[PDB]
Design a protein around this ligand. Sequence first.
Ligand SMILES: NC(=O)c1ccc[n+]([C@H]2O[C@@H](COP(=O)(O)OP(=O)(O)OC[C@@H]3O[C@H](n4ccc(N)nc4=O)[C@H](O)[C@@H]3O)[C@@H](O)[C@H]2O)c1
Lengths: 329, 329
Amino acid sequence: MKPKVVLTHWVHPEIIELLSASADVIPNTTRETLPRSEVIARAKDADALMAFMPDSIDSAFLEECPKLRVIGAALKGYDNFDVNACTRHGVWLTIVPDLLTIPTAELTIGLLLGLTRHMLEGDRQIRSGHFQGWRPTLYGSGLTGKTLGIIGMGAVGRAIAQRLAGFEMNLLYCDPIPLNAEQEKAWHVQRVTLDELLEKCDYVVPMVPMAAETLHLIDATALAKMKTGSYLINACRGSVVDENAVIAALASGKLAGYAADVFEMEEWIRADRPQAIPKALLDNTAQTFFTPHLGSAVKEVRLEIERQAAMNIIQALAGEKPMGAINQP
Amino acid sequence: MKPKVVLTHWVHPEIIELLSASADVIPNTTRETLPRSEVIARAKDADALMAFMPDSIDSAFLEECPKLRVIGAALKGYDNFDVNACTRHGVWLTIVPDLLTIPTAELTIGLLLGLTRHMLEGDRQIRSGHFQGWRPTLYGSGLTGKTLGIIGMGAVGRAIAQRLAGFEMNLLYCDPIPLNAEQEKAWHVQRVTLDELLEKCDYVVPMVPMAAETLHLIDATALAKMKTGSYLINACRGSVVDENAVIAALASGKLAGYAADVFEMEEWIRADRPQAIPKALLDNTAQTFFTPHLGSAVKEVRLEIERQAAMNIIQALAGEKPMGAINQP
Ligand SMILES: NC(=O)c1ccc[n+]([C@H]2O[C@@H](COP(=O)(O)OP(=O)(O)OC[C@@H]3O[C@H](n4ccc(N)nc4=O)[C@H](O)[C@@H]3O)[C@@H](O)[C@H]2O)c1
């Protein structure tokens, strides 16, 4: 009998066919997240699982699935997995590197341009049917000559700087790890401290990992150091920005706008956590621009992420050591 | 008429004999890489292609080979292939299992010993004809009693630690995921943070698994934390080490030497890659030891890689789903 593989979320039909040669596949045929109780029910006698961001693989999950030999995570960050529990239960845990970086950088620049040029309200004005030509409205803020700061010059930060290098801006970054001289010259980016960054920037773009030290890194104290009329673009992680302080800074005029691909509400791991995006942000269509965690939502990229997770499962089930393993069961 | 298979690079004669049973084989009789135009000229009417590291398969290539049914990559990865273009053109794309671990670990230790014991300069002095017996020269650094640190503890790192376990060294490692307690005791290897590792090590060996690769893990900041007089050995991947930072550390005396099997000029997916090994490294024969990507240049391993690629081609040409498929055409 073939091993069984459960996929918790929708995958491209080619991926199901690929896995079907060596396993019986139980897919999620909908675009929705199944409740944890239904994922566990399907996985209880599975040999393999393809896991996604909404899955929380803890010891209780693994105890319900005694046949599991590999979890192929279609993800880079494995915060939602208990790796040591996987290891103790004899379960390979694999991830996918690199693939999310560039589409997230591209989306961040889209949020920057959409927010600073009032493009959403512009589209709404077009859809109203009342367009009759140019009007002296929706005057925004341009990029050339402005100062943009990247907090965290890592994979996404470097992808963003490379792309903004052609926009004739003044680019700053802060990071405990500096770029080298060739990189700083290539992108014309200057290293500063976080305080200097917050002081000088028209646009602030946090791209740090979520850690104890970066929880609410952009809080009321950071916003108070920022330039009046500045913009904040958040596509890193939901709780790096204090959304209640942002609401206050928009109300007072400290921030001219806020754009975000990520939200505190999706950080289910923290106890003090809201279950909805604050209404004062949702109602403020004039000053905000939001996307539902679309950072890596590019069809060709999602397919290659799914392919890497599938190959890890195939390799593990064949008795090989999977290419993306982070543990050793 | 049998189908035709084009092999872009040299293979062992028994592989050509294996393929000859079901296909007419067009080999590369030389040890050279053919220009792309010649590969296309051979493969325009081929049913199958065996591809290697120097190959790159894009949509334009596939448009010129309308009879192609399978590309069997003699590779454990597929960065140089447009997988979805293969799929859309009806072409199977296959890979082989990762067979590189142990020969890479062995070569890394060869690099360590050759570099630290001045063996290349020693051989030069022998061939100069002027050897007249022992002299107080070419004094190097030994292994016993010294501290060596492996950054990353996946398959290759574990192979290195197992082999260095008998050398009476102080072995350290860092990895987000720890080794088993039985392995730590068996190899006498101790987990430390990266900072502790860089601080304590006479020898530093970056060997991060594919899931943990990051650009310039060893940069100017890391090198400034290392011990003065230390040695750096890179058989991992070119992008792991900032080669211009290394040149500066050799020049300053921070590094006593650098050995490498891989080079930044090899990173054809990174936009800002170089196209030569820096002249300041090539000239420095006194403090460097280099090999041209030989980590798995072992006859047994190369043969098995070719054999698996040939079997995939044979399977696909016979109308089966090949065992190493990564797509579904
Ligand atoms: N919206 C999405 O769908 C999406 C997609 C992918 C990723 N993400 C997010 O998940 C994270 C991973 O981003 P990353 O760039 O891949 O992570 P990393 O390379 O480790 O970060 C650079 C680091 O910054 C550090 N650092 C640390 C502390 C400090 N006080 N200052 C620092 O500066 C340190 O030195 C290093 O350079 C965010 O970046 C963000 O992108 C979202």
